[PDB]
Amino acid sequence: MIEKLRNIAIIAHVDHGKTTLVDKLLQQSGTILAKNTAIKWNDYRINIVDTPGHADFGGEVERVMSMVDSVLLVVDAFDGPMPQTRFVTKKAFAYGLKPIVVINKVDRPGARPDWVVDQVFDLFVNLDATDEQLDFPIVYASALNGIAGLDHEDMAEDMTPLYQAIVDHVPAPDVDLDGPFQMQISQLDYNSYVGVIGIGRIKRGKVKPNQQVTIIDSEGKTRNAKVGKVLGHLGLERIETDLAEAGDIVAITGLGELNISDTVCDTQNVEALPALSVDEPTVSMFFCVNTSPFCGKEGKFVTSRQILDRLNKELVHNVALRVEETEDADAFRVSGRGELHLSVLIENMRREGFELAVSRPKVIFREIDGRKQEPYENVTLDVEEQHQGSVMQALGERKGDLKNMNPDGKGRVRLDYVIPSRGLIGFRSEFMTMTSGTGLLYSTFSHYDDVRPGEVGQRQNGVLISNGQGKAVAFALFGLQDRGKLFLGHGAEVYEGQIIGIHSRSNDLTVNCLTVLVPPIRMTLEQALEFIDDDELVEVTPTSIRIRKRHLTENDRRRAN
Ligand SMILES: Nc1nc2c(ncn2[C@@H]2O[C@H](COP(=O)(O)OP(=O)(O)O)[C@@H](OP(=O)(O)OP(=O)(O)O)[C@H]2O)c(=O)[nH]1
Ligand SMILES: [Mg+2]
């Protein structure tokens, strides 16, 4: 009794029918999405918790999964599953949740349900349990009409098969109704009338308005408070309730500054629920003050603490990242998930109005049981068949181990790889031009494991390094084309230590561009960041970035060799 509850989270790539599907289930029942939709189906109560967009919204994806006992993956019947919902699905699997797959928009012409079933099945190469990829039921749906069915040619007149599937395959909450009250805050909310609102799934006991309560944070500090209002979810709404009990997803009111991972307990049985998530970072990278002779030239805020300041503001936007204090009091060791994670952070701090020097990204090594390990990750690539042998050749040099390949039948092909992050770093640049911009690459962290012995191929070419500061003249540049490709044309302002071109040969060449042209190479941030070597840096400024050596002068470099 009182276990007719079904707490489920819903996942769907944008414009795949998740707002429209839940919108049916609501109107066909006895009861933008809301962060939670409550649904009455006969005597079952279904909580459909919405998942956020496909950026790390502070890691709300783990918070949401912490409140649900199953996940509902909605998939377009033609386009199939999209890579953007990779990580949300991944985390649902990490929380041991078994999925319910809804294949929507099945009434569209060209719909290929058989194909998207295989795609979704294959996508569950999220090293997930046999258990999870086993026996995930499949419901076909056309929410535009409101049709659900276990087959797509045979189909019910409404959404009943979906309800039934939810009831049948979603476990009831693992909660104790008789124990003392216990509830962890999973999300927060505010209304100028009520104050701060705390949201979670009651793990134990029951709660009434005006009940006395004790809140314990992660570390173990406690305070006493009196709950004001207990708000239960009904439609897209919250009504005041006189009673909420274990398994219920509700919102609480009378408590003060509730923090996510706070545990609300009966005053005499205070027991904190374990703080839940952390994406351990896997790629480190150094942010530095821009030591260039172009200090404050194109960027407003450029100081040591000026950077460290914002280096403790984005800490809360993001638990995947860390920030550390280096001994050089003008440079900092910031780590993240992928190189893509840290990259756009700069591209934002760029037009956030900054100026900083940044190293090349390296994997964070870890020692486990005396044996050092590194991060490996899953890579899937979609190229044409003309590049097939080419990108295959390249990935093997970066210690990529081929696991699968699947021709499109229409001239393309998808490859699958297990690769150390070490070998994958900065590939995208080499990928696109190689595949001429048509190929597609996706990556997902898998596991740490014993390092692959050896090193990845270095840059091979050397760089043309400026010997002085001034405006580059076309007269000189024309002479440099005899021995490489350039990064600028006539009239560009340069200083000493700056890298201005790519040497045709292997060694670094200090060159003078101060004493008509072929088109210059302009490098995007990512592009240029993949180019940089360990003894070099990228200088980033609000409308463009420069490539520079660590030691700016000829003499200093020679000493360091
Ligand atoms: N053929 C077919 N189409 C479906 C179905 N379900 C949803 N759609 C289409 O997708 C659109 C709904 O967008 P959602 O898919 O619900 O948005 P969401 O991913 O963020 O949840 C509808 O038009 P829309 O509301 O005008 O889109 P928009 O203007 O809100 O972006 C409708 O055209 C279906 O079962 N069959
Ligand atoms: Mg929309």
Coordinates of C-alpha atoms and ligand atoms in Angstrom, one line a residue:
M1 CA 0.0 0.0 0.0
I2 CA 1.1 3.5 -0.9
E3 CA 3.6 1.9 -3.3
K4 CA 1.8 2.7 -6.5
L5 CA 4.5 5.3 -7.0
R6 CA 6.7 5.6 -10.1
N7 CA 9.5 8.2 -10.0
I8 CA 11.0 8.5 -13.5
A9 CA 13.3 10.9 -15.3
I10 CA 12.8 11.8 -18.9
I11 CA 15.5 12.3 -21.5
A12 CA 15.1 13.7 -25.1
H13 CA 17.2 15.7 -27.5
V14 CA 15.6 19.0 -28.4
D15 CA 12.6 18.8 -30.8
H16 CA 12.1 15.0 -30.2
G17 CA 8.8 15.2 -28.5
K18 CA 9.4 15.2 -24.7
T19 CA 7.3 18.3 -24.0
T20 CA 4.6 17.0 -26.3
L21 CA 4.7 13.4 -25.0
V22 CA 4.3 14.3 -21.3
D23 CA 1.6 16.8 -22.4
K24 CA -0.5 13.8 -23.7
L25 CA 0.0 11.6 -20.6
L26 CA -1.3 14.5 -18.5
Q27 CA -4.5 15.0 -20.4
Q28 CA -5.2 11.3 -21.0
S29 CA -5.1 10.7 -17.2
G30 CA -7.2 11.0 -14.1
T31 CA -5.3 14.0 -12.8
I32 CA 8.2 24.1 -21.6
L33 CA 7.9 21.3 -19.1
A34 CA 7.8 21.8 -15.4
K35 CA 10.9 20.5 -13.5
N36 CA 8.6 17.8 -12.4
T37 CA 5.2 16.6 -13.7
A38 CA 2.9 14.6 -11.5
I39 CA 0.4 12.2 -13.1
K40 CA -2.5 10.2 -11.9
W41 CA -3.2 6.9 -13.8
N42 CA -6.0 5.0 -12.0
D43 CA -4.4 4.5 -8.6
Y44 CA -0.8 5.0 -9.7
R45 CA 1.1 8.2 -9.2
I46 CA 3.8 8.9 -11.8
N47 CA 6.4 11.6 -11.2
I48 CA 8.1 12.6 -14.5
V49 CA 11.2 14.6 -13.6
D50 CA 12.6 16.8 -16.4
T51 CA 16.3 16.7 -17.2
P52 CA 18.2 19.9 -18.1
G53 CA 19.8 21.1 -21.3
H54 CA 22.9 19.4 -22.6
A55 CA 25.5 21.5 -20.7
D56 CA 26.6 20.7 -17.1
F57 CA 23.9 22.8 -15.3
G58 CA 26.0 22.4 -12.1
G59 CA 25.5 18.7 -12.4
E60 CA 21.8 18.7 -11.9
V61 CA 21.7 15.5 -14.0
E62 CA 23.0 13.6 -11.0
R63 CA 20.6 15.4 -8.7
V64 CA 17.6 14.4 -10.9
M65 CA 18.8 10.8 -11.1
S66 CA 19.1 10.8 -7.3
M67 CA 15.4 11.3 -7.1
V68 CA 14.3 8.7 -9.7
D69 CA 14.2 4.9 -10.0
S70 CA 14.1 4.8 -13.8
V71 CA 14.8 6.9 -16.9
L72 CA 12.6 7.5 -19.9
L73 CA 14.6 8.0 -23.2
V74 CA 12.6 9.6 -26.0
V75 CA 14.0 9.1 -29.5
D76 CA 12.9 10.4 -32.9
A77 CA 11.9 7.5 -35.2
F78 CA 13.9 8.9 -38.1
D79 CA 17.0 10.8 -36.8
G80 CA 17.5 8.2 -34.1
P81 CA 19.3 9.0 -30.9
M82 CA 21.6 12.1 -31.0
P83 CA 25.1 12.2 -29.4
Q84 CA 24.1 15.3 -27.3
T85 CA 22.1 13.1 -24.9
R86 CA 25.2 10.9 -24.3
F87 CA 26.2 12.2 -20.9
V88 CA 22.7 12.4 -19.4
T89 CA 22.1 8.8 -20.4
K90 CA 25.5 7.9 -19.1
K91 CA 24.9 9.3 -15.6
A92 CA 21.5 7.5 -15.5
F93 CA 23.4 4.3 -16.0
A94 CA 26.0 5.3 -13.4
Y95 CA 23.1 5.5 -10.9
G96 CA 22.1 2.0 -11.9
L97 CA 18.9 3.0 -13.5
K98 CA 17.4 0.8 -16.2
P99 CA 15.8 2.7 -19.1
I100 CA 12.5 2.8 -20.8
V101 CA 12.9 3.7 -24.5
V102 CA 10.2 5.7 -26.3
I103 CA 10.5 5.9 -30.0
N104 CA 8.5 9.0 -31.0
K105 CA 7.4 10.6 -34.2
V106 CA 6.8 7.1 -35.8
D107 CA 4.0 8.4 -38.0
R108 CA 6.4 10.5 -40.1
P109 CA 7.3 9.2 -43.6
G110 CA 10.7 7.6 -43.8
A111 CA 10.5 6.6 -40.2
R112 CA 12.8 3.7 -39.5
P113 CA 11.9 2.2 -36.1
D114 CA 13.9 -1.0 -36.7
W115 CA 17.0 1.1 -37.4
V116 CA 16.7 3.4 -34.5
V117 CA 16.2 0.4 -32.2
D118 CA 19.7 -0.9 -33.3
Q119 CA 21.1 2.6 -32.9
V120 CA 19.8 3.0 -29.4
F121 CA 21.0 -0.5 -28.5
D122 CA 24.4 0.2 -29.9
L123 CA 24.6 3.6 -28.1
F124 CA 24.3 1.6 -24.9
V125 CA 28.0 1.0 -25.4
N126 CA 28.2 3.1 -22.3
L127 CA 30.0 0.2 -20.8
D128 CA 26.6 -0.3 -19.1
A129 CA 25.4 -3.5 -17.4
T130 CA 24.0 -6.4 -19.4
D131 CA 21.0 -5.9 -17.0
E132 CA 20.4 -2.4 -18.4
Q133 CA 20.8 -3.0 -22.1
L134 CA 18.9 -6.3 -21.5
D135 CA 15.2 -6.0 -21.5
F136 CA 14.8 -2.2 -21.8
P137 CA 11.3 -2.2 -23.1
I138 CA 10.4 -0.3 -26.3
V139 CA 7.3 1.8 -26.6
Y140 CA 6.5 3.4 -30.0
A141 CA 4.7 6.7 -29.8
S142 CA 3.2 9.5 -31.9
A143 CA 2.4 12.2 -29.3
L144 CA 1.1 14.5 -32.1
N145 CA -1.8 12.0 -32.3
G146 CA -1.4 10.4 -28.9
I147 CA -0.7 6.8 -30.0
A148 CA 1.4 4.4 -28.0
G149 CA 2.1 0.7 -28.7
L150 CA 4.6 -2.2 -28.3
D151 CA 4.6 -2.5 -32.1
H152 CA 4.4 0.5 -34.5
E153 CA 2.2 -1.1 -37.1
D154 CA 0.0 -2.5 -34.5
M155 CA -0.8 0.4 -32.1
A156 CA -3.3 1.2 -29.4
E157 CA -5.8 4.0 -29.7
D158 CA -4.1 6.0 -26.9
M159 CA -1.2 6.2 -24.5
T160 CA -2.1 3.2 -22.3
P161 CA 0.8 1.0 -23.4
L162 CA 3.2 3.7 -22.2
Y163 CA 1.5 4.0 -18.8
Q164 CA 1.5 0.2 -18.5
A165 CA 5.2 0.0 -19.4
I166 CA 6.0 2.7 -16.8
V167 CA 4.1 0.8 -14.2
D168 CA 5.5 -2.5 -15.1
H169 CA 9.2 -1.7 -15.6
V170 CA 9.9 1.2 -13.2
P171 CA 10.6 0.0 -9.6
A172 CA 8.8 1.5 -6.7
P173 CA 11.0 3.8 -4.6
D174 CA 13.5 2.1 -2.3
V175 CA 12.2 3.9 0.9
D176 CA 11.0 3.2 4.4
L177 CA 7.7 4.7 5.3
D178 CA 7.8 4.0 9.0
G179 CA 11.2 5.4 9.8
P180 CA 12.0 8.9 11.1
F181 CA 11.8 11.8 8.5
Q182 CA 14.7 12.1 6.2
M183 CA 15.0 14.1 2.9
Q184 CA 18.0 15.4 0.9
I185 CA 17.5 18.6 -1.1
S186 CA 18.1 17.8 -4.8
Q187 CA 17.0 21.1 -6.4
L188 CA 16.1 24.6 -5.2
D189 CA 13.5 27.2 -6.1
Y190 CA 12.3 30.6 -5.1
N191 CA 9.2 32.7 -4.9
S192 CA 9.1 36.2 -3.3
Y193 CA 6.1 35.1 -1.2
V194 CA 7.3 31.9 0.3
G195 CA 11.0 32.3 0.3
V196 CA 13.6 29.7 -0.5
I197 CA 12.1 26.4 -1.7
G198 CA 13.7 23.0 -1.1
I199 CA 13.0 20.1 -3.4
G200 CA 13.7 16.4 -3.0
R201 CA 12.4 12.8 -2.7
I202 CA 11.5 11.9 0.9
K203 CA 13.7 9.0 1.7
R204 CA 12.2 8.1 5.1
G205 CA 9.4 9.1 7.4
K206 CA 6.7 11.7 6.8
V207 CA 6.4 15.5 7.0
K208 CA 3.6 17.9 8.0
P209 CA 3.4 21.7 8.0
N210 CA 4.8 23.4 11.2
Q211 CA 6.7 20.2 12.0
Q212 CA 9.9 20.8 13.9
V213 CA 13.0 19.7 11.9
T214 CA 16.8 19.6 11.9
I215 CA 18.9 20.3 8.8
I216 CA 22.4 18.8 8.4
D217 CA 24.8 19.9 5.6
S218 CA 27.5 17.8 4.0
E219 CA 30.2 18.3 6.6
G220 CA 27.9 17.8 9.5
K221 CA 26.9 21.2 10.8
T222 CA 23.3 21.3 12.0
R223 CA 20.6 23.8 12.6
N224 CA 17.0 23.6 13.7
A225 CA 14.0 25.0 11.7
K226 CA 10.3 24.7 11.4
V227 CA 8.8 23.7 8.1
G228 CA 6.3 26.2 6.9
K229 CA 4.5 24.6 4.0
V230 CA 4.7 21.2 2.4
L231 CA 4.1 21.5 -1.3
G232 CA 3.3 18.4 -3.4
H233 CA 3.2 18.3 -7.2
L234 CA 0.0 17.7 -9.0
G235 CA -0.1 18.9 -12.6
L236 CA 2.5 21.4 -13.6
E237 CA 1.7 22.9 -10.2
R238 CA 2.3 22.7 -6.5
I239 CA -0.5 22.5 -4.0
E240 CA -0.1 22.9 -0.2
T241 CA -0.4 19.5 1.5
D242 CA -1.0 18.5 5.1
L243 CA 1.1 15.4 4.6
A244 CA 3.9 14.1 2.4
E245 CA 5.5 10.7 3.0
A246 CA 8.4 8.6 1.8
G247 CA 8.7 8.2 -2.0
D248 CA 7.0 11.6 -2.6
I249 CA 8.7 14.2 -4.6
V250 CA 7.8 17.5 -2.8
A251 CA 8.9 21.0 -2.1
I252 CA 9.5 22.4 1.4
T253 CA 9.1 26.0 2.4
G254 CA 9.8 27.2 6.0
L255 CA 13.5 26.4 6.1
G256 CA 16.2 29.0 5.6
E257 CA 19.0 29.0 3.1
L258 CA 18.7 25.4 2.0
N259 CA 21.7 24.1 0.1
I260 CA 21.8 21.2 -2.4
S261 CA 22.8 18.0 -0.5
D262 CA 21.4 19.4 2.8
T263 CA 19.5 16.6 4.6
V264 CA 16.3 17.5 6.4
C265 CA 15.7 15.2 9.3
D266 CA 13.4 14.5 12.3
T267 CA 14.9 16.6 15.1
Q268 CA 15.9 13.5 17.1
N269 CA 17.1 11.2 14.3
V270 CA 19.5 13.4 12.3
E271 CA 21.1 11.3 9.6
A272 CA 22.7 12.9 6.6
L273 CA 22.2 11.3 3.2
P274 CA 25.5 10.9 1.4
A275 CA 26.6 13.8 -0.8
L276 CA 26.4 12.4 -4.3
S277 CA 28.2 13.4 -7.4
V278 CA 31.6 14.4 -8.6
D279 CA 33.0 14.2 -12.1
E280 CA 36.7 13.9 -11.4
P281 CA 38.6 16.0 -13.8
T282 CA 40.7 14.3 -16.4
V283 CA 42.4 17.1 -18.3
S284 CA 44.6 19.8 -16.7
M285 CA 45.6 23.1 -18.2
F286 CA 47.5 26.2 -16.9
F287 CA 45.9 29.7 -16.9
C288 CA 48.5 32.4 -16.6
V289 CA 48.8 36.2 -16.4
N290 CA 49.7 37.4 -19.9
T291 CA 53.4 38.1 -19.4
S292 CA 53.7 39.4 -23.0
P293 CA 54.9 42.9 -23.8
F294 CA 51.3 43.3 -24.8
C295 CA 49.9 43.2 -21.3
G296 CA 47.0 45.6 -21.2
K297 CA 46.5 46.2 -24.9
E298 CA 43.3 44.5 -26.0
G299 CA 42.0 43.2 -22.7
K300 CA 40.5 45.1 -19.7
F301 CA 41.0 42.8 -16.7
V302 CA 44.5 41.2 -16.7
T303 CA 45.9 40.7 -13.2
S304 CA 46.9 37.8 -10.9
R305 CA 44.0 37.8 -8.5
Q306 CA 41.8 39.2 -11.3
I307 CA 42.1 35.7 -12.8
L308 CA 42.0 33.8 -9.5
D309 CA 38.8 35.7 -8.6
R310 CA 36.9 34.4 -11.6
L311 CA 38.7 31.1 -10.9
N312 CA 36.5 30.8 -7.8
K313 CA 33.2 31.9 -9.5
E314 CA 33.0 29.3 -12.2
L315 CA 33.8 26.7 -9.5
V316 CA 30.1 26.7 -8.6
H317 CA 28.9 26.6 -12.3
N318 CA 30.8 23.3 -12.4
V319 CA 31.9 20.5 -10.1
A320 CA 33.8 18.8 -12.9
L321 CA 36.5 21.4 -12.6
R322 CA 39.1 22.2 -10.0
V323 CA 41.4 25.1 -9.4
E324 CA 44.8 24.9 -7.7
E325 CA 47.5 27.3 -6.5
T326 CA 50.8 27.1 -8.4
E327 CA 54.1 28.3 -6.9
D328 CA 54.3 30.8 -9.7
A329 CA 51.8 33.3 -8.2
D330 CA 50.7 34.3 -11.7
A331 CA 49.7 31.0 -13.1
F332 CA 47.1 28.4 -12.0
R333 CA 46.4 24.7 -12.5
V334 CA 42.8 24.4 -13.6
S335 CA 41.4 20.9 -14.5
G336 CA 38.3 19.8 -16.3
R337 CA 36.5 17.0 -18.1
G338 CA 37.6 17.3 -21.7
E339 CA 39.6 19.8 -23.6
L340 CA 36.3 21.0 -24.9
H341 CA 35.2 21.7 -21.3
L342 CA 38.1 24.1 -20.6
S343 CA 38.3 25.5 -24.1
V344 CA 35.0 27.4 -24.3
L345 CA 35.6 28.6 -20.8
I346 CA 38.3 30.8 -22.2
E347 CA 36.3 31.7 -25.3
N348 CA 33.8 33.1 -22.8
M349 CA 36.4 34.7 -20.4
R350 CA 37.7 36.1 -23.7
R351 CA 34.7 38.3 -24.4
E352 CA 34.0 38.4 -20.6
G353 CA 36.9 40.9 -21.2
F354 CA 40.1 39.2 -20.2
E355 CA 43.6 38.5 -21.2
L356 CA 45.6 35.4 -20.1
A357 CA 48.3 33.0 -21.2
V358 CA 47.4 29.3 -21.4
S359 CA 49.5 26.1 -21.7
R360 CA 48.7 23.0 -23.7
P361 CA 46.3 20.5 -22.1
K362 CA 47.6 17.4 -20.5
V363 CA 45.9 14.3 -19.0
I364 CA 45.8 14.0 -15.2
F365 CA 47.7 10.8 -14.3
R366 CA 46.7 8.8 -11.2
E367 CA 48.4 6.0 -9.3
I368 CA 46.2 3.1 -8.3
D369 CA 47.8 0.1 -6.5
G370 CA 51.4 1.3 -7.3
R371 CA 50.6 1.2 -11.0
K372 CA 50.1 4.6 -12.6
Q373 CA 47.0 4.9 -14.8
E374 CA 45.6 7.4 -17.4
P375 CA 42.1 8.2 -18.7
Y376 CA 40.9 6.1 -21.6
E377 CA 37.7 7.1 -23.4
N378 CA 35.2 5.9 -26.1
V379 CA 35.4 7.6 -29.5
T380 CA 32.9 7.1 -32.3
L381 CA 33.6 8.7 -35.7
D382 CA 31.4 9.2 -38.7
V383 CA 33.4 9.8 -41.9
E384 CA 33.2 9.2 -45.6
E385 CA 34.8 6.0 -47.1
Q386 CA 37.5 7.9 -48.8
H387 CA 38.9 9.0 -45.5
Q388 CA 38.2 5.6 -43.9
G389 CA 41.7 4.2 -44.2
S390 CA 43.2 7.6 -43.5
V391 CA 41.6 8.4 -40.1
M392 CA 42.1 4.7 -39.2
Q393 CA 45.8 5.0 -39.9
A394 CA 46.0 8.2 -37.8
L395 CA 44.1 6.9 -34.7
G396 CA 46.3 3.9 -34.4
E397 CA 49.4 6.1 -34.2
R398 CA 47.7 7.8 -31.2
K399 CA 47.3 4.5 -29.5
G400 CA 43.7 4.0 -30.6
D401 CA 42.3 0.4 -30.4
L402 CA 39.7 -0.4 -33.0
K403 CA 36.5 -2.0 -31.5
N404 CA 33.9 -1.7 -34.2
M405 CA 33.1 -0.3 -37.7
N406 CA 29.8 -0.1 -39.5
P407 CA 29.4 1.1 -43.2
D408 CA 26.4 3.3 -43.8
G409 CA 25.4 1.6 -47.0
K410 CA 25.2 5.1 -48.4
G411 CA 28.9 5.9 -48.7
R412 CA 29.7 6.8 -45.1
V413 CA 30.9 4.7 -42.2
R414 CA 31.1 4.8 -38.4
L415 CA 34.2 3.7 -36.5
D416 CA 34.4 2.9 -32.8
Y417 CA 37.6 3.3 -30.7
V418 CA 39.0 2.8 -27.2
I419 CA 41.7 5.5 -26.9
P420 CA 43.7 7.1 -24.1
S421 CA 42.8 10.8 -23.7
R422 CA 46.5 11.4 -24.2
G423 CA 46.3 10.3 -27.8
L424 CA 43.0 12.0 -28.6
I425 CA 44.0 15.5 -27.4
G426 CA 43.9 18.0 -30.3
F427 CA 42.8 15.5 -32.9
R428 CA 39.7 17.5 -34.0
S429 CA 41.9 20.0 -36.0
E430 CA 43.7 17.1 -37.7
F431 CA 40.3 15.4 -38.1
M432 CA 38.3 18.0 -39.9
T433 CA 40.8 19.1 -42.6
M434 CA 41.7 15.4 -43.1
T435 CA 38.0 14.6 -43.6
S436 CA 37.5 17.9 -45.4
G437 CA 35.0 19.1 -42.8
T438 CA 32.4 16.4 -43.4
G439 CA 33.4 13.9 -40.7
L440 CA 31.9 13.8 -37.2
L441 CA 33.6 12.8 -34.0
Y442 CA 32.2 12.1 -30.5
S443 CA 33.9 11.1 -27.2
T444 CA 32.9 9.8 -23.8
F445 CA 35.1 9.1 -20.8
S446 CA 35.2 5.4 -20.0
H447 CA 37.7 4.4 -17.3
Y448 CA 41.2 4.8 -16.0
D449 CA 43.6 1.9 -16.8
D450 CA 47.3 1.1 -16.9
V451 CA 49.1 3.6 -19.2
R452 CA 50.0 2.6 -22.7
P453 CA 53.8 2.6 -22.8
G454 CA 55.4 5.3 -25.0
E455 CA 54.5 8.8 -26.1
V456 CA 52.3 10.4 -28.8
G457 CA 54.0 11.9 -31.8
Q458 CA 55.2 15.5 -31.2
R459 CA 54.7 18.4 -33.6
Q460 CA 57.4 17.4 -36.1
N461 CA 57.6 20.9 -37.6
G462 CA 59.4 23.8 -35.9
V463 CA 58.1 27.3 -35.6
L464 CA 59.2 30.7 -37.0
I465 CA 59.8 32.9 -34.1
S466 CA 60.0 36.7 -34.3
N467 CA 63.3 38.3 -33.2
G468 CA 61.8 41.8 -32.6
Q469 CA 58.9 44.1 -32.0
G470 CA 57.2 46.1 -34.7
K471 CA 54.9 46.0 -37.8
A472 CA 55.5 43.1 -40.2
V473 CA 56.4 44.3 -43.7
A474 CA 55.4 42.5 -46.9
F475 CA 59.0 42.8 -48.2
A476 CA 60.2 40.4 -45.4
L477 CA 57.2 38.0 -45.4
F478 CA 57.6 37.2 -49.1
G479 CA 61.1 35.9 -48.2
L480 CA 59.7 33.7 -45.4
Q481 CA 57.4 31.8 -47.8
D482 CA 60.6 30.2 -49.1
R483 CA 60.6 28.2 -45.9
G484 CA 57.1 27.7 -44.5
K485 CA 53.6 29.1 -44.1
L486 CA 52.7 32.4 -42.3
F487 CA 50.2 33.6 -39.7
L488 CA 50.0 37.2 -40.9
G489 CA 50.2 39.7 -43.8
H490 CA 51.5 43.3 -44.2
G491 CA 50.9 45.7 -41.4
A492 CA 50.4 43.3 -38.4
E493 CA 51.9 44.3 -35.1
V494 CA 54.3 41.8 -33.6
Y495 CA 56.8 41.4 -30.6
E496 CA 59.8 39.3 -29.8
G497 CA 59.2 35.7 -28.8
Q498 CA 55.9 35.5 -30.7
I499 CA 55.4 32.7 -33.2
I500 CA 54.6 33.9 -36.7
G501 CA 54.8 30.8 -38.9
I502 CA 55.3 27.1 -39.4
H503 CA 58.9 26.2 -40.3
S504 CA 59.2 23.8 -43.3
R505 CA 61.8 21.9 -41.3
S506 CA 61.8 20.4 -37.8
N507 CA 63.9 22.9 -35.8
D508 CA 62.7 26.3 -34.4
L509 CA 63.9 29.3 -36.4
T510 CA 64.2 32.8 -35.0
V511 CA 63.4 35.1 -37.9
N512 CA 63.0 38.8 -38.8
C513 CA 59.8 40.1 -40.4
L514 CA 60.6 43.8 -39.8
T515 CA 63.2 44.7 -42.4
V516 CA 52.5 40.0 -53.0
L517 CA 51.7 37.5 -50.2
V518 CA 50.0 34.2 -50.1
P519 CA 46.9 34.0 -47.9
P520 CA 47.7 33.9 -44.1
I521 CA 46.6 31.2 -41.8
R522 CA 44.2 32.3 -39.1
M523 CA 43.8 29.8 -36.3
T524 CA 40.7 29.3 -34.2
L525 CA 41.4 29.0 -30.5
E526 CA 41.0 25.2 -30.5
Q527 CA 43.0 24.9 -33.7
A528 CA 45.9 27.0 -32.3
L529 CA 45.7 25.3 -28.9
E530 CA 46.3 21.9 -30.5
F531 CA 49.3 23.3 -32.3
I532 CA 51.1 24.6 -29.2
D533 CA 54.1 22.6 -27.8
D534 CA 55.1 22.2 -24.1
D535 CA 57.5 25.1 -24.2
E536 CA 54.9 27.4 -25.7
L537 CA 51.7 29.3 -24.7
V538 CA 48.6 30.8 -26.2
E539 CA 47.9 34.5 -25.4
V540 CA 44.2 35.1 -25.5
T541 CA 42.7 38.6 -26.0
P542 CA 39.0 39.7 -26.4
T543 CA 39.0 39.9 -30.3
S544 CA 42.0 37.7 -31.1
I545 CA 44.6 35.3 -29.6
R546 CA 48.4 35.0 -30.3
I547 CA 50.8 32.1 -30.2
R548 CA 54.0 32.6 -28.1
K549 CA 57.1 30.9 -26.8
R550 CA 57.5 30.5 -23.0
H551 CA 60.9 32.1 -23.0
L552 CA 60.6 35.2 -25.2
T553 CA 64.3 35.7 -26.1
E554 CA 66.7 33.7 -28.3
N555 CA 69.2 33.4 -25.4
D556 CA 66.8 32.1 -22.8
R557 CA 65.5 29.3 -25.1
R558 CA 69.1 28.1 -25.9
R559 CA 69.8 27.9 -22.2
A560 CA 66.8 25.6 -21.7
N561 CA 68.3 22.9 -24.0
Ligands
LIG1 N1 5.1 14.0 -37.0 C1 5.2 14.2 -35.5 N2 5.7 15.5 -35.0 C2 5.8 15.7 -33.5 C3 5.4 14.7 -32.7 N3 5.6 15.1 -31.4 C4 6.1 16.3 -31.5 N4 6.2 16.7 -32.8 C5 6.7 17.8 -33.4 O1 7.7 18.4 -32.5 C6 7.3 19.6 -32.1 C7 7.3 19.6 -30.6 O2 8.5 19.9 -30.1 P1 9.1 19.0 -28.9 O3 9.8 17.8 -29.4 O4 7.9 18.6 -28.0 O5 10.2 19.9 -28.0 P2 11.2 19.3 -26.9 O6 12.1 18.3 -27.6 O7 12.1 20.3 -26.2 O8 10.5 18.5 -25.8 C8 5.8 19.8 -32.7 O9 5.7 21.1 -33.4 P3 6.0 22.5 -32.7 O10 5.2 22.5 -31.3 O11 5.5 23.7 -33.5 O12 7.6 22.7 -32.4 P4 8.2 24.1 -31.7 O13 7.8 25.3 -32.4 O14 7.8 24.2 -30.3 O15 9.7 24.0 -31.7 C9 5.5 18.9 -33.5 O16 5.6 19.4 -34.9 C10 4.9 13.3 -33.2 O17 4.6 12.5 -32.5 N5 4.8 13.2 -34.7
MG2 MG 11.1 23.6 -28.1

